Design a protein around this ligand. Structure first.
Ligand SMILES: Nc1ccn([C@@H]2O[C@H](COP(=O)(O)CP(=O)(O)OP(=O)(O)O)[C@@H](O)[C@H]2O)c(=O)n1
Ligand SMILES: [Mg+2]
Ligand SMILES: [Zn+2]
Lengths: 1320, 619
DNA sequence: GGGTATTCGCCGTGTACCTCTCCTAGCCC
RNA sequence: GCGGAGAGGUA
DNA sequence: GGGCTAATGACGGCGAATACCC
């Protein structure tokens, strides 16, 4: 095992062997943004694509072209940490290489001038941190992936609710990634209408007209021709027999001398076979049959020239006669089979008012730009740019892939723009489905839903910025002179940076990282939101989209989704799933070669999954990849059933791949109802880091994956040996293997101590390792918030007993023992930030001095001369954090004070001054604190490099005459001034002296740079001189009213803290910590907590046994025997830990770590069965039934019917009563409607809403409602008179009229409506 | 836009204001409370009652001027807490829970100052509030004026609202721990400690139980003196020997005077306790019912704690014959599928057959599990053995009506039935596993679909119901009981709704509390049974049950003659109180609230006709 | 012209509460 | 620093 | 930094405004 694993091994249950290890969990964000930057030649996804899409920018025929070579991302000026500290966006300057070329005005095009620009600057692009977040204003943001309809063509049905007369009317919608939408829909009367993206519905054929297709061409392209020959008389038809399928006979179908189909009998299959084998081609037909058909071509009179019948004209006897006399032997009619082949395009052509191409373009223009007279070239240009301009209309690689796959063409790679064959094929498939030889698509299929991650959205926003600046430059290059300007006055960065900063800062999908728990962070980054741009709104969304689809299997978590209003629209991504090249979702599966289940893994998307029969992971495989059962359980078309051994194409990788990380963390998920599992995961993401997080006694094994993959731990990059350990930094000397040959040095990890997370929780790292321990690459050096030795420790595991204890755990409420507060185990540190800003007013700049009008010296006592609190001072609500004076000059103070009712210690103060004033005290202390540390780090590195150089000088000095007596006793610095015999050796000494100088000079420039960065004014908003930020840290202890939860969906409010003596206790005398209500189990079918309690009791019992054997310190042999018997525990387990291989010191350290209880690992669905828990309980010498007899701590009497006790892992959620609790008597009121403010930040009153009003009306409660309506909130005179009256000790009151009503009157009167309060 | 719409105006700022002297905090159990009180944090109470504090401080002279009173409150010295205790004494506060569905969403309580930052809510009232101690919060308002105080204490106080305004039934019924404790206490066991000993009264029953010389439930003959008010309000003691358990006597200690012993003699589950409270109210009145409810809570909590009821994995017993039932159903499905592949039966017929056989197997396994779990305690008397209704903790929680129904027990220990796919069609193979066992990926996934669909439904339904109830309260707001009696003869003919098989709803509740339009006659003419319009209270309704009246014409609000409102008589009695409606009451809002609360509440709760078969012997 | 369908467009879509960022705009001297 | 958008969460 | 000017992913219900059939 590895070193962090050898420290504390976790007993892992679980029978099937993990073939695929959990991937890097943040792969989504990192890989997408990497694709975004990715200097790459061939334009694929990536900033490169945006540039090549928008450039080259040619003038409005001015013959001055602009070309793009390549771009480079500048090095960020500010690293992540300082950028967060200073409240700026963490970003890189973006530089792009351009050339302006001016070809000769009147010559074959050749540049008369080409000028190359020196890497022009087009704005700042925020960079993503190592962990996958963005620092946008000193706040860590996450860009959530977005699920949305993929570009392409989709054929929907939208039936049932269609005019309530049946008439299922189909529609084909063509959606591009960039460009206007196309829509073809039907109508009750089976007429096919086109609707440009979202306008009125025109007859579809106009678009066919716009494509330069003539009516005859259309009827050719769509309908199957029918030939009518006239030979010596009366209309004989060339007939293809197979066309007759399903047709009542209208005439007598005789052929070759024999009547085959009698007139009136529908043609039967017998007749079909007869006629086919007989080879009947042509049959004479009565004129009544033709009296109804439609004509394909436009038959003109060849003799005189006058047209007679036009393309798509209904035939009448008179027209047939005219045709026969004109001399037309061959008549081309249409095949309209009302069953299969309908007259859809025909009827649209009849309704279609437009005839020529020009009229169609005119109608299009009058739809797009209604009311202005259309000019020919205007319509031509509009329509061309609409769907066929590469620049304006682009589908995608993905859009084209979906388009070609939908229309069953082998070719996958196409052109972005919609070619005409595309549109015609789409309409053909639509009418095809309308006949009924095809299915409509379901939008909810993940094969129809594509994921846009961060980099893609950023690319879109950047392209938009480019199109803005492009229009601008176009105009400026046309109007302005051509040859004078160089290519940097011409290009403006403002629109680019505006669009990019708009997306990253002010966007729906760019939201704060939910940063109070490591799980919270990691799950926030791997999220798939169906909202945002071009996304359905959460409130509007119908159930069908929200409902889980069989396609989500192994792609999206079915159980983890907010239970709020946007349920189902959030859908956290599953464990193993990834994004395709085209942005779809694929999940791993193990290939199955007909008999053996091989080990090569293939990632399958939704469509590919649809075809095959996939076997489940929890399928029994024996030693050679063969299924133990003859009929195994698989799924083929989204439905599971039994298939034979030699039929399964694939198999699930592992049981966990169905569920997200949050859900994968819940033990015994298989025993929890889905609802309560949902709530469990959602809450578990809300747990607050306690002071010392420990570990789950009952985990799932995913804890290490989550902790490591989140950025909260400090992890070794190059393995080595720990050289220095401090509670601020871990310094490791690298191993020679991994040691770089040239300019290697050592590795230094600076840790982060109490800092403020987004949610005001603490982010503190503790060292795991000790001096001299060897570490390997990828081990956990330092524990982040709520993580221990590499494992996720969301909360803490305490001894619970399921019983009702005098109704203090009545409802989901929880009883807790005072021992929990005594051991100080649910006390969290929180951290508030406060800011005092001194701006520049026109009456004079405000000052931060400590001289503050009419404040007692009591308030100043804790303030320094500069007027800022001392670091470490304990403050309370209302104390003055910093001194400020408002200019009038003083007599008034705008000094920041601690908010009311919050009290903690000032741990840190920061000062940011644009003025860069010479003499600010706090600035001096903070600068010295940062500087001395920086100096120490640079000094350490320099000293190591100097020791190496001195060693090299000794290694050269030893050659050419050994001198060891004199040398070793004089100091080392007295070795450069010494000399040697003139040779090459002196040249080497000169080399090393110049290298010494070079190391000095590099140190000096690095130091100068760091000191310039520290000193510089930290760029503030216009008008603001300087800002002072103060961090308070507060230790919040658990108290009645706080919310606690388990991992299984059980919740509760801490109802009472009991003394230790009152709490139930076992025979041995150990009291329980929490007394949890049993009645929450049966109706809320979360059984996972009960099994967790049993297994936790087993694990803590074993841990107790190891503590007992260790406290008496028997001998290594006993410990090894017991721990080995424990780790083995039966068979079929994939552990097989060998205690013997580990050294006795490592085994002693492992026993020390296991003394608190041996940690178990039950995977979610491949979990621990009851019998194994029973065995583990027996090994610990505990009751096999998992219930114990308990004695009442108050009475001392035994409880009848023993109760379940055991350790369960509980969490303290961020819902803290002291944060929730709030009251006001009187305070500030609002401006327009004189009601008191709403909220907690400003005192704020509760909202007596209309439902509450109704409640009061239901009672006869007229006076309570009256005062509540006027005196309590809205009536100004009433409220002040009532305050005075109450103070006077009388409770009478006058009601008056609410001010809000007067505001209403004034506002209605502000319309043209006179509304008066009458009097008589 | 400012006027129209929800967020803008009338709704927002003119019917939905934001009061002063109000607070909010998390709610907590506080079992020790009286029904008419609530635990209120010291600091919140001080903040709310600030101006009262100033007034009282100035009256006693502890502060010269108002600013000194403010400074003294802001230091919070002992005198301030004494003044707070004195002012808070009789001052009642209003407690409200965010979805004020019906008028019981706001109730008045007398506060008791406590440490901590959470409001303590009496358990019994949670049902009225739909309150749960899982992070629910409540707001607390302070009635300021003298008139507000009288209204809160008289009309709105918790103890005055024990009957729901919607239907006459009690609202404050014990919920889960109380009923579990009471059930455990009253159920008997064939053989225990102190079997068959004769006790002189309940007092020595408790002597025996608390000293451990007798089990809390053990069959015994006890002498008890019950009181019955048969005369004109006088109580007559009858004292005899009944055969009961120790526990039933211990419970009998609390029971107020007027009630028959029989009431407690049974198993005493949810229904039994609710009807106990009901009878106590109808016979004795309000105040005894209040005190008796508090006593019920205390004894239930106490003896639930003494019981030590828990839930272990082995407490839910897998029926021994489950595997056989499942294998049989699988063999049958295999046979029917093979007989399908040959093509003698369509797909729909096979679907129906499979679904029906699986349903039958599910019912079979469920019944087998319930038989196994239900009556499994085969404990021995002196000699031979016997069998009785088990003491399985999950079974007592099910049967008592504390938590869970037979269905959830099935989902725990049986097979968790059939599921519905998105479109509503039912999967052919069911989920054979249960939560005691482990589901597998497919079965879990399916149940996930179920749960997700339910949660989405609840949210959509909640919005639709909130709209519907808003419309209702809006339309009927102006309707008030304005006149005492309009004097019309009109009325509606009320019958018992006999839908098909049997009597879904009997006459007595359908007619209870309505005044009659005209006298109804016995089966023999000129035998008037009920005078001209009389309010039909329980006694008249029971009398009608004794006779065989089938249909009764009762005055209805719709036919009421009164202009601009309704008259008391046309409406009837039903209220949180028992008497005829009082002139002035806003019946429109109560009706609208009572009709809308269930619809929203029920969505949260969710989270052939070939031959006729006469059920009873008749013409 | 008069009645019947059919399209068309407006109005509504539960409460209470708690965190965070961001706010008139654009260009040149 | 009254407001209003967007995001998330609680019951 | 300061001063001046001017697009597409709801749905139902209901009642009015044409489409059309005599
Ligand atoms: N989106 C939401 C979710 C919840 N609520 C309200 O918060 C409470 C939660 O009920 P609940 O279903 O969570 C618990 P309960 O109803 O007592 O049943 P159980 O204890 O047997 O499980 C209900 O009163 C809901 O009206 C809401 O207004 N909007
Ligand atoms: Mg609740
Ligand atoms: Zn009346």
């Amino acid at each position: 095992y590895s070193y962090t694993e050898k420290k504390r091994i976790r007993k892992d249950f679980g029978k099937r062997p993990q073939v695929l290890d959990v991937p890097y969990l943040l792969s989504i964000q990192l890989d997408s943004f990497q694709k975004f930057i990715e200097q790459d030649p061939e334009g694929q996804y990536g900033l490169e694509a945006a540039f090549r899409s928008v450039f080259p920018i040619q003038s409005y025929s001015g013959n001055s072209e602009l070309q793009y070579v390549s771009y480079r991302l500048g090095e960020p000026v500010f690293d992540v940490q300082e950028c967060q500290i200073r409240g700026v966006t963490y970003s890189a300057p973006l530089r792009v290489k351009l050339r302006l070329v001016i070809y000769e005005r009147e010559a074959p095009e050749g540049t008369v001038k080409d000028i190359k620009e020196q890497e022009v600057y087009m704005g700042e692009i925020p960079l993503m941190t190592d962990n996958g977040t963005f620092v946008i204003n000193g706040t860590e943001r996450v860009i959530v992936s977005q699920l949305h309809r993929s570009p392409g063509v989709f054929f929907d049905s939208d039936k049932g609710k269609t005019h309530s007369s049946g008439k299922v009317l189909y529609n084909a919608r063509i959606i591009p990634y960039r460009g206007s939408w196309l829509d073809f829909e039907f109508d009750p009367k089976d007429n096919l209408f086109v609707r440009i993206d979202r306008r009125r519905k025109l007859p579809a054929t106009i678009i066919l007209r716009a494509l330069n297709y003539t009516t005859e061409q259309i009827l050719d392209l769509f309908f199957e021709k029918v030939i009518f020959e006239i030979r010596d008389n009366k209309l004989q038809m060339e007939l293809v027999p197979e066309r007759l399928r399903g047709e009542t006979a209208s005439f007598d179908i005789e052929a070759n001398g024999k009547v085959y189909v009698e007139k009136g009998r529908r043609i039967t299959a017998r007749h079909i076979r007869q006629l086919e084998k007989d080879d009947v081609k042509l049959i004479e037909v009565p004129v009544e049959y033709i009296a109804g058909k439609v004509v394909a071509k436009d038959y003109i009179d060849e003799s005189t020239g006058e047209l007679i019948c036009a393309a798509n004209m209904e035939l009448s006897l008179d027209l047939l006669a005219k045709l026969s006399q004109s001399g037309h032997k061959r008549i081309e009619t249409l095949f309209t089979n009302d069953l299969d082949h309908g007259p859809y395009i025909s009827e649209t052509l009849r309704v279609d008012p437009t005839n020529d191409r020009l009229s169609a373009l005119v109608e299009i223009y009058r739809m797009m730009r209604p009311g202005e007279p259309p000019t020919r070239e205007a319509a031509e240009s509009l329509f061309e740019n609409l769907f066929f301009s590469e620049d304006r209309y682009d589908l995608s690689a993905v859009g084209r892939m979906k388009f070609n796959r939908s229309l069953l063409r082998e070719e996958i790679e196409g052109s972005g723009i919609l070619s005409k064959d595309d549109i015609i094929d789409v309409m053909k498939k639509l009418i095809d489905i309308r006949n009924g030889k095809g299915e409509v698509d379901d939008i909810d299929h993940l094969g129809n839903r594509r994921i846009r991650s961060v980099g893609e959205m950023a690319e879109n926003q950047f392209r938009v910025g480019l199109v803005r600046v492009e229009r601008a430059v176009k105009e400026r290059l046309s109007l302005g002179d051509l040859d004078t300007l160089m290519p940097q006055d011409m290009i403006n960065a403002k629109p680019i940076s505006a669009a990019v900063k708009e997306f990253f800062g002010s966007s729906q999908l760019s939201q704060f990282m939910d940063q109070n728990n490591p799980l919270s962070e990691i799950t926030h980054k791997r999220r798939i939101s169906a909202l945002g741009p071009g996304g359905l709104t959460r409130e509007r969304a119908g159930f069908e989209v929200r409902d889980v689809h069989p396609t989500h299997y192994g792609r999206v978590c079915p159980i983890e989704t907010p239970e709020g209003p946007n349920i189902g629209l959030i859908n956290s991504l599953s464990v193993y799933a990834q994004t395709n090249e085209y942005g779809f979702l694929e999940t791993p599966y193990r290939k199955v070669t007909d008999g053996v289940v091989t080990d090569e893994i293939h990632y399958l998307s939704a469509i590919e999954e649809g075809n095959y029969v996939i076997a489940q992971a929890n399928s029994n495989l024996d030693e050679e990849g063969h299924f133990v059962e003859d009929l195994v359980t698989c799924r083929s078309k989204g439905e599971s059933s039994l298939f034979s051994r030699d039929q399964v194409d694939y198999m699930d990788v592992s049981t966990q791949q169905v569920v997200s990380v949050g859900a994968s963390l819940i033990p015994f998920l298989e025993h929890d109802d889905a609802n309560r599992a949902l709530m469990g995961a959602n809450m578990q993401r809300q747990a607050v880091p306690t002071l010392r997080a420990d570990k789950p006694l009952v985990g799932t094994g995913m804890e290490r994956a989550v902790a490591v993959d989140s950025g909260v731990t400090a992890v070794a990059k190059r393995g080595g040996v720990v050289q220095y350990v401090d509670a601020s930094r871990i310094v490791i000397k690298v191993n020679e293997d991994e040691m770089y040959p040239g300019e290697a040095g050592i590795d230094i990890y600076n840790l982060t101590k109490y800092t403020r997370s987004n949610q005001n929780t603490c982010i503190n790292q503790m060292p795991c390792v000790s001096l001299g321990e060897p570490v390997e690459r990828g081990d956990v050096l330092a524990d982040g918030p709520s993580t221990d030795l590499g494992e996720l420790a969301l909360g803490q595991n305490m001894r619970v007993a399921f019983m009702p204890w005098n109704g203090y755990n009545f409802e989901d409420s929880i009883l807790v023992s005072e021992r929990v507060v005594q051991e100080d185990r649910f006390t969290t540190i929180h951290i508030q930030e406060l800011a005092c800003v001194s701006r520049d007013t026109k009456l004079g700049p405000e000052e931060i001095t400590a001289d503050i009008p009419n404040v007692g010296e009591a308030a100043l006592s804790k303030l320094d001369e500069s007027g800022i609190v001392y670091i470490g001072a304990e403050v309370t609500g209302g104390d003055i954090l910093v001194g400020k004076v408002t200019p009038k000059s003083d007599v008034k103070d705008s000094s920041l004070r601690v908010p009311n009712g919050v009290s903690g210690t000032v741990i840190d103060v920061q000062v940011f001054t644009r003025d860069g004033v010479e003499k600010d005290k706090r600035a001096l202390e903070i600068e010295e604190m940062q500087l001395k540390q920086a100096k120490k780090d640079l000094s350490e590195e320099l000293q190591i490099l100097e020791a190496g150089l001195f060693s090299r000088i000794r290694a050269v000095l030893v050659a050419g005459g050994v001198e060891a007596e004199k040398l070793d006793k004089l100091p080392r610095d007295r070795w450069l001034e010494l000399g040697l015999t003139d040779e090459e050796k002196q040249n080497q000494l000169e080399q090393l002296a110049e290298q010494y100088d070079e190391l000095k000079h590099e140190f000096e420039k690095k130091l100068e740079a760091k000191r310039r960065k520290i000193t510089q004014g930290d760029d503030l908003a216009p008008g603001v001189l300087k800002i002072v930020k103060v961090y308070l840290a507060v230790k919040r202890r658990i108290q009645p009213g706080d919310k606690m939860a388990g991992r299984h969906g059980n919740k509760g409010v801490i109802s009472k803290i009991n003394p230790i003596e009152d709490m139930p206790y076992d025979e041995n005398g150990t009291p329980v910590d929490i007394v949890l209500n049993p009645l929450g189990v049966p109706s809320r079918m979360n059984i996972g907590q009960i099994l967790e309690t049993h297994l936790g009791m087993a694990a803590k019992g074993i841990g107790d046994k190891i503590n007992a054997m260790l406290k008496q310190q028997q001998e290594v042999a006993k410990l090894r025997e017991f721990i080995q018997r424990a780790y083995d525990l039966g068979a079929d387990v994939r552990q097989k830990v060998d205690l013997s291989t580990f050294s006795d010191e490592e085994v002693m350290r492992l026993a020390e770590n296991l003394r608190k209880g041996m940690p178990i690992a039950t995977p979610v669905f491949d979990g621990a069965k009851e019998a194994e828990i029973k065995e583990l309980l027996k090994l610990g010498d505990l009751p096999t039934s998992g219930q114990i007899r308990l004695y009442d701590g108050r009475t001392g009497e035994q409880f009848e019917r023993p109760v379940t006790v055991g350790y369960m892992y509980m969490l303290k959620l961020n819902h803290l009563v002291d944060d929730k609790m709030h009251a006001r008597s009187t305070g500030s009121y609002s401006l327009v409607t004189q009601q008191p403010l709403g909220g907690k930040a400003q005192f704020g009153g509760q909202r007596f809403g209309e439902m509450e009003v109704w409640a009061l009306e239901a009672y006869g409660a007229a006076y309570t409602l009256q005062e509540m309506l006027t005196v309590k909130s809205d009536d100004v005179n009433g409220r002040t008179k009532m305050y005075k009256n109450i103070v006077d000790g009388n409770h009478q009151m006058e009601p008056g009229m609410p001010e809000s009503f007067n505001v209403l009157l004034k506002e209605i009167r502000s319309l043209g409506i006179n509304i008066e309060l009458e009097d008589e | 836009d400012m006027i129209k719409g929800k967020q803008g105006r009338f709704r927002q700022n003119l019917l939905g204001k934001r009061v002063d002297y109000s607070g909010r905090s998390v709610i907590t159990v506080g079992p020790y409370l009286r029904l008419h009180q609530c635990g209120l944090p010291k600091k919140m109470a001080l903040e709310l009652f600030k101006p009262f504090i100033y007034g009282k401080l100035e009256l006693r002279g502890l502060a010269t001027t108002i600013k000194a009173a403010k400074k003294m409150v802001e230091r919070e010295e002992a005198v301030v807490w004494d003044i707070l205790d004195e002012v808070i004494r009789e001052h009642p506060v209003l407690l409200n829970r965010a979805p004020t569905l019906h008028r019981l969403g706001i109730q008045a309580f007398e506060p008791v100052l406590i440490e901590g930052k959470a409001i303590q809510l009496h358990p019994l009232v949670c049902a009225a509030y739909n309150a749960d101690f899982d992070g629910d919060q409540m707001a607390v308002h302070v009635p300021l004026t003298l008139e507000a105080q009288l209204e809160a204490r008289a009309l709105m106080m918790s103890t005055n609202n024990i009957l729901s305004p919607a239907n006459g039934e009690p609202i404050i019924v014990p919920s889960q721990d109380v009923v579990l404790g009471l059930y455990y206490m009253t159920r008997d066991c064939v053989n225990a400690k102190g079997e068959g000993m004769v006790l002189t009264g309940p007092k020595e029953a408790e002597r025996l139980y608390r000293s451990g010389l007798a089990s809390l439930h053990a069959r015994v003959k006890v002498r008890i003196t019950e009181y019955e008010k048969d005369a004109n309000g006088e109580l007559v003691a009858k004292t005899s020997l009944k055969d009961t358990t120790v526990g039933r006597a211990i419970l009998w200690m609390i029971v107020p005077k007027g009630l028959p012993y029989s009431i407690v003699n049974q198993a005493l589950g949810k229904k039994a306790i609710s009807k106990m409270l009901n009878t106590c109210y109808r016979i004795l009145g309000l105040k005894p019912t209040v005190i008796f409810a508090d006593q019920i809570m205390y004894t239930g909590f106490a003896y639930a704690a003494r019981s030590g009821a828990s839930v272990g994995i082995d407490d839910m017993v897998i029926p021994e014959k489950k595997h056989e039932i499942i294998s049989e159903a699988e063999a049958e499905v295999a046979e029917i599928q093979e007989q399908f592949q040959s093509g003698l039966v369509t797909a729909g017929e096979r679907y129906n057959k499979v679904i029906d056989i699986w349903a039958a197997a599910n019912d079979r396994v469920s019944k087998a599990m319930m038989d196994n779990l239900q009556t499994e305690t085969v404990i021995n008397r002196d000699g031979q053995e016997e069998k009785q209704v088990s003491f399985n903790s999950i079974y007592m929680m099910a049967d008592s009506g504390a938590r869970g129904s037979a269905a959830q027990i099935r989902q725990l220990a049986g097979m968790r039935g059939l599921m519905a796919k998105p479109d509503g069609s039912i999967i052919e193979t069911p989920i054979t596993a249960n939560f005691r066992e482990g589901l597998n990926v497919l079965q879990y996934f399916i149940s996930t679909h179920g749960a997700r669909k339910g949660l989405a439904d609840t949210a959509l339904k909640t919005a639709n119901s909130g709209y519907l109830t808003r419309r209702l309260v809006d339309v009927a707001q102006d309707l008030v009981v304005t006149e005492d009696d309009c004097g019309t003869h009109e009325g509606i003919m009320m019958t018992p709704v006999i839908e098909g098989g049997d009597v879904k709803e009997p006459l007595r509740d359908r007619v209870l509390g309505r005044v009659t339009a005209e006298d109804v006659l016995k089966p023999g003419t000129a035998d008037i049974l009920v005078p001209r319009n009389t309010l039909l209270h329980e006694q008249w309704c029971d009398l009608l049950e004794e006779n065989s009246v089938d249909a009764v014409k009762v005055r209805s609000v719709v036919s009421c003659d009164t202009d601009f409102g309704v008259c008391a008589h046309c409406y009837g009695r039903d209220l949180a109180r028992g008497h005829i409606i009082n002139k002035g009451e806003a019946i429109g809002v109560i009706a609208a609230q009572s009709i809308g609360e269930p619809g929203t509440q029920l969505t949260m709760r969710t989270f052939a006709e070939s031959s006729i078969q006469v059920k009873n012997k008749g013409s």
